[PDB]
Structure 1
Amino acid sequence: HMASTYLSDMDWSSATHGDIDKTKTVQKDAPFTTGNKGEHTKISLLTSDDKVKYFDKGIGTVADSPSVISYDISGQGFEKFETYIGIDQSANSSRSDHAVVDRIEIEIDGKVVYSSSVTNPEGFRYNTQAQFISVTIPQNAKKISLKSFAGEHTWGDEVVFADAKLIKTVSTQTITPDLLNKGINGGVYLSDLEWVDATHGDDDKSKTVQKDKPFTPGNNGSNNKIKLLIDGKEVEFNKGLGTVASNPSSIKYDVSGANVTRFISYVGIDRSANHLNSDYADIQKFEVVADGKVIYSSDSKYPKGIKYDTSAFLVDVEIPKDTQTIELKSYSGKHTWADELVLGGALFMAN
């Protein structure tokens, strides 16, 4: 059960670079120069056999004596640090005195735990192929430092720590939209299951509750994914359910032949749904019901209901065992016509 956190999705406690222009800063998820210029170029290194590889995540800097990027990792339980290292393909390397990096170092708590000295005794040039390194982290480590040594000049020393991440072994994962998009071990998506039956609050009964799509767009033949507001940002979902709330509407699952321990989903209104400004909620509440018994209700934490501009909230409820039947109940706001709900990434943990 491996958990990862990219360094570019964190905050450094300190960061230095070897560019004279101190208004420029260390670039997250981009090369140093192109990033500071506002260009959209991504991090690119050389894998085996002069093969160019592009990366979404990483850190981009200019080496100094040394350039140092430090992260505070006190009591976070990390075990491994892993990254590609090398000079970016975008580096200004027409001059031989450009893109010449002496050394790359990983330091943990004042101790150098990795040095590129062994693999690269002549350091890195513009054409040197990337090194993928895995650096062990001691039990109670506090501070990790990425260090790049420029040598005689900093020119073209566009050092990238491509795909840089910190790794640990956790018991249970922490639920995020990306985790539900990537998958979870033992998590079965409801949209990959058959319900006993389902009802909705739309008059057109030729329409049906939708799998991996919002209700109306799904019923019209659109293949667009579910999209929700998560902490102010619009976030797509690969899996989920699209339905219309009623008095309530319901979707029924038979779990009498299984050992389901958990129901997990984000719940909100799809970004493509019709809405109107109102003091009143679009959806009054959403309930999870285990054998006629309500085990979760959204009004326990959202008593006013949910509007279009409400951030999708996370439902993560324990399922009592020997549960035969699970019911998902969607309740109309009653004052508007907007009744369309989506369950983003909806899944059962079978354990």
Structure 2
Amino acid sequence: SRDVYLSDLDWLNATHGDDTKSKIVQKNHPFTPGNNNQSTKISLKMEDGSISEFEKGLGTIAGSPSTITYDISGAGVTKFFSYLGIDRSANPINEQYAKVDKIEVVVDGKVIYSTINQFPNGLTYETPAIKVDLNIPENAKRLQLKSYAGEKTWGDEVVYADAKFTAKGDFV
């Protein structure tokens, strides 16, 4: 029926790998700038080599995993769309920073998408934005966005840029 940005909904919970455990996943901003009350927009390097800034999305720090969970029961979600990448605001000091093992989209406990298959070496600061367009099973109740930091969480500014559902209904 219409597109509904995930950042325009409330999550059930949203964990992240940051050292400051009272920081929170950010709506429409990358994680660290967002928590620092900066206006900085989410931005990624695209396949065509340009940097795109996004109006909407989610910013987290990858964890073991970081898990952002939505109740989509009754909402008639048929599609999930997002770009995935490390936000340009991350500081890629060296190979140890901004290195994410994988990102998964999970629906009612089942992984329906993982970067691991096309991205066997994970994501890093140089990885171009990953375009994800997914069919969502009918009558689904829970959708989770999981990002896996691997060895360390340093610089793992994971953003789900322009993350939105196609949905028929009202959300809980």
TM-score, normalising length: structure 1: 0.46
Question: Contact between 1:239 and 1:346, CA under 8 Å: does it hold in 2?
Answer: yes
Question: Contact between 2:86 and 2:157, CA under 8 Å: does it hold in 1?
Answer: yes
2:26 counterpart of 1:210: yes
2-side partners of 1:298 and 1:321: how far apart?
23
One-letter code of the match for 1:262?
K
2:15 is aligned to 199
2:85 is aligned to 268
The percentage of aligned residue pairs carrying the same residue is 56
SS of residue paired to 2:116: helix
Question: Contact between 2:78 and 2:138, CA under 8 Å: does it hold in 1?
Answer: yes
Which residue among 61, 69, 77 is the counterpart of 1:244?
61
Which residue among 250, 253, 257 is the counterpart of 2:74?
257
Cα distance change on mapping 1:250 and 1:279 into 2, 3 Å: closer
2-side partners of 1:279 and 1:192: how far apart?
33
2:160 counterpart of 1:343: yes
- How many angstroms does 1:254 deviate by? 0.5
SS of residue paired to 1:301: coil
SS of residue paired to 2:7: helix
Which blocks of at least 5 consecutive residues in structure 2 are unaligned?
none
1:57 is aligned to none
Question: Contact between 1:217 and 1:224, CA under 8 Å: does it hold in 2?
Answer: yes
1:278 is aligned to 95
Where do 4+ consecutive residues of structure 1 move more than 2 Å? 276-281
1:8 is aligned to none
2:142 counterpart of 1:331: no
Q: CA RMSD in A?
A: 1.6
Larger radius of gyration: 1
SS of residue paired to 2:123: coil
Superimposed CA distance per residue, residues 145-187 of structure 1 (whole angstroms, 9 cap, x where no aligned partner): xxxxxxxxxxxxxxxxxxxxxxxxxxxxxxxxxxxxxxxx711
1:296 is aligned to 113
One-letter code of the match for 2:17?
G
2:41 counterpart of 1:225: yes
Superimposed CA distance per residue, residues 65-114 of structure 1 (whole angstroms, 9 cap, x where no aligned partner): xxxxxxxxxxxxxxxxxxxxxxxxxxxxxxxxxxxxxxxxxxxxxxxxxx
1-side partners of 2:70 and 2:97: how far apart?
31
SS of residue paired to 2:34: helix
2:2 is aligned to 186
Question: Contact between 2:62 and 2:156, CA under 8 Å: does it hold in 1?
Answer: yes
Matches within 5 A, 1:104-115: none
Question: Contact between 1:210 and 1:219, CA under 8 Å: does it hold in 2?
Answer: yes
- How many angstroms does 1:279 deviate by? 8.2
2-side partners of 1:344 and 1:248: how far apart?
19
Matches within 5 A, 1:77-88: none
- How many angstroms does 1:206 deviate by? 2.0
SS of residue paired to 1:344: strand
Cα distance change on mapping 1:275 and 1:336 into 2, 3 Å: farther
Which one has more relative contact order, counting CA pairs under 8 Å at least 6 apart? Answer: 2
Which blocks of at least 5 consecutive residues in structure 1 are unaligned?
1-184
2-side partners of 1:274 and 1:259: how far apart?
39
2-side partners of 1:301 and 1:196: how far apart?
30
One-letter code of the match for 1:189?
Y
